[PDB]
Amino acid sequence: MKKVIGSIEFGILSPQEIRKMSAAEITVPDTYDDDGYPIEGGLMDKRLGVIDPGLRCETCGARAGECPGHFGHIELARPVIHVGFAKTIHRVLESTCRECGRIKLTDEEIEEYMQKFEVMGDRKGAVDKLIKEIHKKAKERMVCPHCGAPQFPIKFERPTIYWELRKDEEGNEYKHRMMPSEVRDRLEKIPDKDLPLLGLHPEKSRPEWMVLTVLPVPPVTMRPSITLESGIRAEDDLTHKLVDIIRINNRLKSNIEAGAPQLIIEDLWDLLQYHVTTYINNETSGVPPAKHKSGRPLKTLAQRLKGKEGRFRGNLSGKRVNFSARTVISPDPMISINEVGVPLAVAMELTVPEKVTEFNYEKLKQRVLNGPEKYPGANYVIDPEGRRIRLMESNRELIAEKLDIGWTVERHLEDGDVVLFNRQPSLHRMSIMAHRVRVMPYRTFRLNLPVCPPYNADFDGDEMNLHVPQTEEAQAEAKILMEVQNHIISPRYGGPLIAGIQDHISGGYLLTREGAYFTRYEVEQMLMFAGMDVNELPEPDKYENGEPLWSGKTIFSLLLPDDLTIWYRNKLCDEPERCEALEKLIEEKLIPDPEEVRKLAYDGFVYIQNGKLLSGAVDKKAYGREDGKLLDIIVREYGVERARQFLDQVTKLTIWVITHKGFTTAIDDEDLPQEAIDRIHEIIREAEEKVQRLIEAYKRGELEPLPGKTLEETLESKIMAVLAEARDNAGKVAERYLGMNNHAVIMAKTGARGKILNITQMAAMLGQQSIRGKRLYRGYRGRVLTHFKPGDLGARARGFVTNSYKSGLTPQEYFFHAMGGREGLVDTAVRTAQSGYMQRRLINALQDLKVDYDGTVRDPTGIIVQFKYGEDGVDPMKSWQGKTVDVDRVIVRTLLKMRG
Template identity: 55%
Template sequence: KKKKIIIEKPTTFYEEEENKGSRRITPIEILERLKKMNDNDLRILGISPENARLEWVVFTVLPIPPVCARPSITLDSGIRSEDDLTHKLVDVIRINQRLRENIDAGAPHLIVEDLWELLQYHITTYFDNQVSGIPPARHRSGRALRTLTQRLKGKEGRFRSNLSGKRVDFSARSVISPNPYISINEVGVPIEIAKILTIPTNVNDWNIEEMKQMVLNGPNRHPGANYIIRNDRRRIDLRYVKNRKMIAEMLAPGFTVERHLNNGDLVLFNRQPSLHRMSIMAHEVKIMDGRTFRLNLTVCPPYNADFDGDEMNLHVPQSEEARTEAELLLKVQEHILSPRFGGPILGGIQDFISSVFQFTSKESLYNIKDTLNLLFMGGVFDMTPDFSLEELTPVVTDPEPMYSGKQIFSTLFPDDLNIRVKSKFCKKCEVCTEEDCEYDAYVVIKNGKLITGTIDENSFGAMQSNSILQRIIKDHGNARGRQFLDNSTKMLLYVIRQNGMTMGLDEVYVYGKAYEKIRKILEDADDESEKLIKAFHENDTEVLKRAPGRSMRETLELRIRQVLAEARKQAEESAAEFIGDEAHSVIMTKSGARGNILNLGQMSAVVGQQAIRGERINRGYSSRTLPHFKINDLSPKSRGFVESSYRNGLKPVEFFFHAMGGREGLVDTAVRTSTSGYMQRRLVNALQDMVIENDGTVRNSDKNIIQFSYGDDGIDPMHTDHSDAVNLDVLLLKAKSLDIDEVHEEVKKRPVKKVPKKEVKKEKKEKKEKIDIEEPAKDEETVKDHSEEELMKIFEEETGKNAIWRGKVTKNFLEWKEERESK
């Protein structure tokens, strides 16, 4: 009869016996039982008896890792310190020795069992020092030992720390700073870094002179070289070479020179945390002075970088294959469109959006000098060398010719660009007048000319679908998109320098009638809140009608929050009206460059209700938030409503409530980051082996089908038009913008269709007659002189019919051929 086996974690086994309680089974007994299992039993358990047997899981001997796996270190003081594994093995050997001695001496059973248990403990902790239920083995200092499992497990273990990711050579790290004059494809590298990072270059007949010069320059002059690898693979370190000229003369094809990083080399640039594919991209090197990496401003969004002290990593690919892959797959211009939503992840940011907004507004006019400067900065003459200013018609001619910003900006567009999009500051009128919009908020670009509308974040910003950049890339490819982005930002830099962008405290200073109006709005809100609180205390359901599914207290909170939110909104609108549309801070919010109207309202009018977990502040002392207020005070002031604006300064109590609200934001951010990080890790691990096979199915590493078609529609989001496989609106716009007369002219130029059969026969007879008269001698040679393919071509030209149809020679062709031969 089977007896029940009980396991007491981690390594003790008991066997229940009828009427006798339980008896402990020793490892020797377990080993004997496991040895008795035959091959068929093992197969039933899913174990292959040829490769593994169950008795092998009980140790009878202990393999000792070699010394290189557990090296001892000598401390500064001269004391030798052994590795944790060595310590553990010493324990195992010591106890094993004592156990052997006690068994040989015939010690009592209890002592032997105790020593046996101790040996088992040491073996267990040797393999894993974090087994639940037993205390971890410790060092003399009290530190838990790091044994075999700990070496492999977790973030600091062998797999994650040394195999999946590792420290690498040929990499650099430095602070980043902005440089709007380099291309988005480039990265500015300090000359000090360029002298240390090297690229192995094979010497051949074409580059030998250049390599000799680099060797002569040596390791301290850029562009130089640090090492030479000879044909016999011996390295020569150029730091210690006295006569570099002799070494340079010795260079021959087949040598490898490890040369300095130079302009135009491809490098990988990365910013941590690497959350998506665009966190590491390939850039071309541009050697610069200074000690920081330089980055174009429009490349910041994919890296999520800013210049408040961020550091970034640079890696130099060493092989030709790696460089080719970087060029074709990793270059920045290949990643302008995001795989997440099919729109551009790069684009205008901050100052660029503010200035394009000013540049393309109705009022912006430029004289000939500024216009030429703008065209030159925007690289218009480089892109189209035959461009001349006469192609633009001045908007104003008196007293001097003036060109509009819209015209100048249009010179950067391709000729077939057609877009219609509403601007960010669209007032959302009931009936949209489109091109005739009085606010100039409807952007229309027809055949590469900006006709109406002011360009802002919606048509020029990063992460905007249906922006100008997206249309250019969809129609003309990534390289043209990069060119547009580089040129437009350089042109806009000139505009920024001309206009200037600034903001002072006086911009958010509201005074006079506007200030009184704001005070009145806040007083009315206070009175309304008091009414509601009174109704709550008196249980007046007419003034305070209970919301469905809410208690009276919840209803009161809800209503007060609504009243205060409305008051803040009205105050904000009054302040915005007073500040006007010309203020630079308003231009920033209107164009979508930075901030929103709420920020302006908080600076100039009222900061508003501070919330914790979406409710008014209600925790603090018993029955009140602070000792400054009466018990059970429900007024807005006592529950975190800040009436002051940042411009006028907060009162101490308001400041305290504001700090409470701010603290929640900080804690929330920290908690969210760690949660989303762990969630991403789990997702990546679950999905990492999925791949699209040649048959279009998505499968994992076991070749199990996950999806029959990728995403169930087989569409790559990166190549969609904001998730649509085909954008009909754009196609319609293109069709509408075509010039009908031009199309008619093109159609007329097309060759006439094939002639009907009867006419063909007549033509054939005429041709034959002509041939007979003019060139009788050539006719005899025709068939013999021409190959089969040439004959087929002649047949098709003469008759307008196919010589081969569905892979077979036609009957008509064979008859025609015979006819010619007989002639």
């Protein structure tokens, strides 16, 4: 059968294990000869694997691409210290007797630590603290309790140098260098019983194994060799490092065999130690990194695992995948929110493997007969034996007549297929959702507009990735869990995320506003466009010139369910006295007459009774993101499919309404009368006079300092407050003369796009430009620009733009606005990286937490983090405004349903 990995046990490889697992001994530094054949005994020996296609492995007998590679070994002439175990070696040497070999602890202390180790074993932090305490206790001891032999302090010098402070005959203290052979001999005397006290395992990690005597050379598959376009081989950095190691080891062995003096032996030993240390880690502190001939700092085994481009993050936690596509996205309101537009070229390339069954034999046979060049067709066919056959014109008929039950047909992407649609960066779980394939002739992806806010995607050149699941389990998981309609409500705040946007909101406002009426032709056309299942028109609301007319509220009410009742205040409510009468009428009777409601109907108060929009207008509070009460109620009380249908119908209806009525903005939308401009100029002049008076008072010393601040900050705060008040007054003056008939004002007030402040800047004035919360000061001595006098603290000299976008900015005001915009762009480009790093840290901290079947949240070890998730066991996605149950809404809905 098949087996899976249950657990992984780590340790230090013994020299005997390295020798036994080795397939060959490497002694020749050279890799390839002049003819290009591998050299026997070299680093590219065929016993370690094969890279070239024509080569055959002497250990496996297989060809390139399927030989896994085999490890070698190098017999070092002298032992060397592993740089990754240097601190542990120093700690163990400090914590152990030099000649006796036992740990410098009493028997009672050893027993006490042995019993304490069993109690604290689950938490690795407790074990680390116990190890540190044992090391600290054993370090201060200068006499071994087991034998009474005197001890000397051991000094550790980076990277792998150990100094022993021995005492001379006259009492002088001199440093004695401990060679790796002496260190290994000292480590060999430690018994197995003291190893748990030192944090080592008797059978897995012996202390003497931390001093390397046999170096395992990696297989050639781990360090592949390529050839360039000019025929010159490009060896890996590990290959060059191993070449240097082999050369130095051979030179050291030859010098040892030649009886060289000890001075040469120490130099060669140090060179070999440096080479081994750089091979293990080329970024070790205090070590000059190994450099290539061209000057390139080589990357080694340590660099291949850590970092963004390491083995873990770059190849294990994340990697490139097959059956994926990426292209520019384009809007498509005609498709549903559950659908994605797939190009025909993309569909004809990406394939889904479908097994031949009894109920789909004819379809797959037709797909095979069509071939790869005829849509809908197939590209590959897999027999039950498991081999893959490519489909072409010559053999498409032979395969088609040979098709049977159990075959696999890699047909092209068809309508209704489930694929993954993703936009980067993936900040939340809504960044990847499963859509339905819709095949289109052009070369762009198509995404429905309400699905843009979950992706945070616009259409100014955005590109998105498409993934096609290949297994039945993955397809089922995508279809059940990751469908678009299943994630309308955002789990972050428990509100709508897949909601209407600017044009939908504007069209809804245009349709549902007071005085909006449509002819029979317009109503029928918008009903056909929206796909609503309406066969007969309702009774006309009024007649004009002998022609029937339908109110927009009547057309909008066809979308709502017949048993839906809700009332609230939208963003268009500017006269609360009109909403108060409606609220009192609703409260008094709880079933108000529809004629009575329409008599005192107000656009700012939306009231839906039994699915009929009796009052109010559609805005961002209707079905907008994070504010749509109607959409949120529809999701919670009618399911996700009904909500998806409602969204698909209402988006098309509002799009038709806004398209044929005519929505536009012009240069006269920001126009203001002369009296408004005069008032704005008067406000600006008054603010400038106030700033000048404050400056004069500060110069005369009459300014009262604020608590906790000196005169300069007090004056700056007063000036900024005055300028902000002036900007607010100018904005109010501009808002006074901009009525509801303005399309830009409609867009700002309905929440479709933009703000009132955006219209204020173009109409009245820009205001004060500031960076880092302070007025502009960077420039010359005492002045931002030379055009102003030195020492001028006035508003105009510090970044107060009196002009507006329509009036035209002065060059100084242009420079100030450029400073502000640069500050904003820099702030965004700096904040993004910190936010991403914090998100990665949080993800890695809370990756393993999940809710068990009993409602508890536990770590993989088993420690209970929460006895109930959220202390109430309620999903934030299904929570009503952060609460457990919306009691008032339930009571009101039940009472209305039973009394209606």
